[PDB]
Amino acid sequence: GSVQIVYKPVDLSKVTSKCGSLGNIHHKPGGGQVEVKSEKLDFKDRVQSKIGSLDNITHVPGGGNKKIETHKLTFRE
Amino acid sequence: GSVQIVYKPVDLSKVTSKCGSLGNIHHKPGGGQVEVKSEKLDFKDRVQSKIGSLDNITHVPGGGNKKIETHKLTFRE
Question: Chain A interface residues facing chain B, Cβ-Cβ under 8 Å?
Answer without folding.
Answer: 18, 20-21
